[PDB]
Symmetry: C2
């Protein structure tokens, strides 16, 4: 069974994208919500740069969508997989 | 709120780091609703029993896998409910 290899390939792309405290926090705060870079940096207490690297990771692997308004960059959860995963992690670890 | 969020995201990230590997994910997926031995895992996953031993060592250390030894053969299972739920979700998402 090596279809498990491609399945685990994409799945591990997702997990590696999520296997980080800051990135996981970002993803958790973006669930059922839409936040900006300033809001994320404020609620997570991070510099916009240290936040920008993580957001760059999330954008590159297609876990988040970006929308520009004025001088504000809004982020949202992108794929259904990351939405479901974040929901499950939220139910298991946040309530 | 946030400090507790870190308090739990730490654990969640331990789990995710443990799962953030193709071979380890394959192991965890095969151990879902199942009890496999080192031989079975090494047979279905074409890798040495030593590399498998390293992956299983990771999974044991971070508590994603319970182990019981009977007649010199080591049987592995999924440990906590969190890991089982996450693996089930991953299976539902990437295998169906």
């Amino acid at each position: 069974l090596q279809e498990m290899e491609k399945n685990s390939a994409k799945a591990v792309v997702l997990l590696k994208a999520m296997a980080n405290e800051r990135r996981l926090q970002i993803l958790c705060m973006l669930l059922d919500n839409e936040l900006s870079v300033g809001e994320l940096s404020s609620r997570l207490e991070l510099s916009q740069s240290a936040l920008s690297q993580h957001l760059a990771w999330l954008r590159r692997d297609g876990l988040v969508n970006t929308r520009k308004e004025a001088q504000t960059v809004f982020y949202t959860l992108s794929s259904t997989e990351v939405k479901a995963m974040i929901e499950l992690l939220h139910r298991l670890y946040c309530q």
